[PDB]
Design a protein around this ligand. Structure first.
Ligand SMILES: N[C@@H](Cc1c[nH]c2ccccc12)C(=O)O
Ligand SMILES: N[C@@H](Cc1c[nH]c2ccccc12)C(=O)O
Ligand SMILES: N[C@@H](Cc1c[nH]c2ccccc12)C(=O)O
Ligand SMILES: N[C@@H](Cc1c[nH]c2ccccc12)C(=O)O
Ligand SMILES: N[C@@H](Cc1c[nH]c2ccccc12)C(=O)O
Ligand SMILES: N[C@@H](Cc1c[nH]c2ccccc12)C(=O)O
Ligand SMILES: N[C@@H](Cc1c[nH]c2ccccc12)C(=O)O
Ligand SMILES: N[C@@H](Cc1c[nH]c2ccccc12)C(=O)O
Ligand SMILES: N[C@@H](Cc1c[nH]c2ccccc12)C(=O)O
Ligand SMILES: N[C@@H](Cc1c[nH]c2ccccc12)C(=O)O
Ligand SMILES: N[C@@H](Cc1c[nH]c2ccccc12)C(=O)O
Ligand SMILES: N[C@@H](Cc1c[nH]c2ccccc12)C(=O)O
Lengths: 64, 64, 64, 64, 64, 64, 64, 64, 64, 64, 64, 64
């Protein structure tokens, strides 16, 4: 139930969930536009999140 | 039992629950108007929340 | 056992419980008048609360 | 486990327990007079508390 | 094991336990005099405590 | 494992344990004299403690 | 595993364990002299401790 | 796993473990000399510790 | 549920998951470019993370 | 998993583990020299630690 | 799920996992170069981590 | 779960794990040189750690 908050500062920001398991592949890519926010949990299927494109990011450890 | 608070600063703000599971898709979109607030938990079915349109957002980590 | 506090600043404020489950719909709408307060927990049946009309709201994360 | 404290600033303050379950109705209404206090827990049967009439209210999140 | 402390500032203060269950009624009323204190837990049978007459009250949330 | 500390400022102070159960009665009354202290837990049998006569009392919530 | 610390400021200080159960009686009285300290836990058999004679006392809640 | 630290400020300090159970008696007495320290846990068999002779004592609650 | 945040200050930064088990090898290498971020959990399969190339790193213990 | 840290300020410092059980005896004595440190846990077999000779000691409660 | 962060200040830094068990031997040695970081957990197989060569190290207790 | 950090200030520092159980003996001695660090957990087999030779040591309780 750990999560991350991501706000796209500029258009065309991209958020990628990476599969948990022995295998590691991108299983979903959610596209974000200027101002749009996403709050994503880590889950049974997502053990890593990748962020392409200039965004603003909050995590338990702080702001990016 | 982790949640997010979202208040629409202007009209026509949109809040999107994304399915938990192997698959990731929008299963519900709740529409908000100027001033209206929504407090949403993450749940057995919602592992990520998306926010289209200019809103004010609180999360465990702070304000957006 | 997480909850929210909602006080109506003006008449005709509306508080909506949204069903927890695969489905998401309004199952109850409680109407509030100037000054009246409601303290509502999230529950086996309510995984999100919506607030129509100008209210004052406290949550774990702070005041709205 | 969670509770709320309510003190009636003026006469004829009213405190309403709302049933927990699929259904949501008032199951009890306890009447309070100037100065009288009530400390009420959320319970197996009460998942939301409503307060009609001008009162002073403490919750985990603070004073109202 | 959550409790409340109640000290009667003036004579004839009254402390009322209200039944936990589907039903809500007064099952015990303990009377207090000037200076006398009572420390009462919420219990399997008491889910709300009511205080008639001018008292000083401590709870988890603070003084009232 | 919750407890209360009670010190008699003057002679003839009285400390009363009240039965936990559907029933509520005094099951023990321990008498205190000037200076004497008692540290009492809440227990399987004591769900409320009453204090007659001018004492000094500490609880989790502070000094009385 | 809750405990209390008691130091006798003057001679002939007395520390009394009171039985936990439906019954409440003194089951042990340990005698303390000027300077002698005792650190006593609450236990399966002791649910209240009484202190006769001028002592200095620490508890979870503070100093006496 | 709660413990106490005892350092003898002078010679001939004495540390006494008292039996846990219905019965309460000294089962061990460990003797300390100027400077010598002992760190003692409460245990399945020791529910109270007594300190004869001028020592320096730390407990969860602080210094003596 | 422990995680690390890694942001590439310059192009061609590399993030390597190392297998948990008796054996220790690289099982995945995710490539990062200027600005791109990755939030990675430790998992059933990743017990150590290696970071090649000039990055900015947050962990529970702080910034690197 | 509670422990103590002991550093010998001068030569010939001695650290003694005392048996946990109904019986209480020295089962091990580890000898320390000027500068040498030992970090010792309390364990299934050691419920008290004794320190002969001038040492520096850290515990959960602080420095000695 | 306790871990250590290690960043090589200079080239040719070496990070060594030591086997948990009755036996203690080096089972893996991961080599680090100027700037490269490694975040390593203690695990079912690694109960001690050794760091040869000039590095910067974060642990639960702080920086070294 | 608990660990200690040890950095050798000078050459030829020695770190000794002592067996957990009724018996207490050295089962491993790991040698450290100027600058080399070791982070060691307490484990099913190590209930005490000894440090010969002039080192710098961090523990939960602080620096040595
Ligand atoms: N499938 C991998 C994905 C992953 C998680 N954390 C990582 C850190 C680095 C590289 C890959 C990963 C896993 O579940 O473990
Ligand atoms: N169905 C996905 C949805 C998701 C959660 N967190 C994410 C982060 C990134 C991308 C997708 C997701 C899941 O339950 O895991
Ligand atoms: N029925 C949905 C309701 C919901 C909860 N949180 C949300 C966030 C966004 C959209 C819908 C929701 C659920 O239980 O998950
Ligand atoms: N019967 C509903 C009552 C309720 C609790 N929280 C709410 C929030 C909004 C509206 C109704 C409710 C339930 O148990 O869930
Ligand atoms: N019998 C009710 C009493 C009660 C508790 N909290 C309340 C709040 C409001 C009204 C009634 C109550 C119950 O156990 O739930
Ligand atoms: N027998 C009652 C005693 C009690 C506890 N708390 C109270 C508060 C008010 C009045 C009575 C009580 C019970 O166990 O619940
Ligand atoms: N035998 C009583 C003793 C007791 C504990 N706490 C008290 C408070 C007041 C009076 C008596 C008591 C019991 O176990 O409960
Ligand atoms: N045998 C008693 C010893 C004891 C513990 N705490 C006390 C306080 C007072 C008097 C005696 C005791 C017991 O286990 O309970
Ligand atoms: N396979 C190893 C990987 C590892 C984790 N932590 C380490 C520290 C140092 C060296 C290797 C490791 C393990 O699960 O334990
Ligand atoms: N064998 C005793 C040792 C002991 C622990 N704590 C003590 C305090 C005082 C005297 C002896 C002890 C026991 O396990 O309990
Ligand atoms: N195999 C040993 C390794 C070890 C852990 N901590 C230590 C401290 C000192 C010496 C050796 C060790 C063990 O699991 O316990
Ligand atoms: N074999 C002993 C080692 C030990 C741990 N802590 C100690 C303190 C003092 C002396 C010996 C020890 C044990 O497991 O308990």
């Amino acid at each position: 139930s750990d999560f991350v908050v991501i706000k796209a500062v500029e258009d065309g920001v991209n958020v990628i969930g990476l599969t948990r398991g022995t295998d590691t592949k991108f299983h979903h890519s959610e596209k974000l536009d200027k101002g749009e926010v996403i709050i994503a949990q880590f889950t049974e299927h997502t053990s890593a999140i990748k962020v392409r494109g200039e965004a603003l990011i909050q995590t338990a450890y702080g702001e990016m």
